[PDB]
Amino acid sequence: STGSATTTPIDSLDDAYITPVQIGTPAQTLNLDFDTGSSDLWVFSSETTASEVDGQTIYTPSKSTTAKLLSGATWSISYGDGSSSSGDVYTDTVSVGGLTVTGQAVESAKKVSSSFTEDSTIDGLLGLAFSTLNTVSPTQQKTFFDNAKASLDSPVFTADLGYHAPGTYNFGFIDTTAYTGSITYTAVSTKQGFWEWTSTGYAVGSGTFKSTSIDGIADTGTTLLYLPATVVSAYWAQVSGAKSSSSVGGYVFPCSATLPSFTFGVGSARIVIPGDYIDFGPISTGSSSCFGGIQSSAGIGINIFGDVALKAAFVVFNGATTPTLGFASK
């Protein structure tokens, strides 16, 4: 089997991407944030504290003839940006772009933190990291991809995120028309539960390539590119007036600037992030200070190849017995 679904930016800055997901019978369609940095499929629901729902579409398990309460199961997750959610668990039928999993754990939120409430466009998350990170207790549950894997034509999914435009998540096949040149594959460590890999280096604009190993995670659920302070400083030093602002919480730059590109290495291959992808707009409405899309990972504890990086590529998440990651230009 295969599946193919369009993923759409939630706003004009590509702060996140939503993909429609069918849950239950009859189908209830929710727009979920596909997140290769976590492993829980959780949804706003009829059980979510009413004051914490503000415009989201909810899953109502009592209206699904295939929903079954997973007795005694609870979940609770905290994300790297400080947000969180928790609740109980159903199993139900879940379909993505024509690909159907029966018996998928659908984690129903009883509580969500303010950042989730405040984002009316995201109805929940669909985790695509390794199932070892799944938070369901006392019986850990599998991701949608893990459940689908054996049925797929090939045990892969691909992320093709757009810049200020829709893109695609495919399951079970590689669309050879969706990228240019070849796909370069690189080793993955699953030791921390992530799609963790090592970039071979970077360049800033038309500058020379610096060969240096950068361990980090391919994370569709993180907006920005978080890299070591040395790398980030080298980037922003090429933008007149750019500075790290403690009050704002990262590098800012004059909105009048033209940003240089940023290149990262995948083996001997190179992915070029155009400068415009690194612009996250005014820090506050009407400001002429703009927020940067490349930020320091210092104090996160891990480097994160988030959407800023991934959207410059066609990305293969290869879930073979030994997982690997592939990157192509597009």
UniProtKB/Swiss-Prot annotation:
Catalytic activity: Hydrolysis of proteins with specificity similar to that of pepsin A, prefers hydrophobic residues at P1 and P1', but does not cleave 14-Ala-|-Leu-15 in the B chain of insulin or Z-Glu-Tyr. Clots milk
Protein name per Swiss-Prot or TrEMBL: Endothiapepsin
Enzyme class, first EC level, given as a word: hydrolase
Gene: EAPA
Gene Ontology biological-process entries: proteolysis
Record bears the keyword Signal: yes
Membrane-spanning ranges: none
Domain of life: Eukaryota
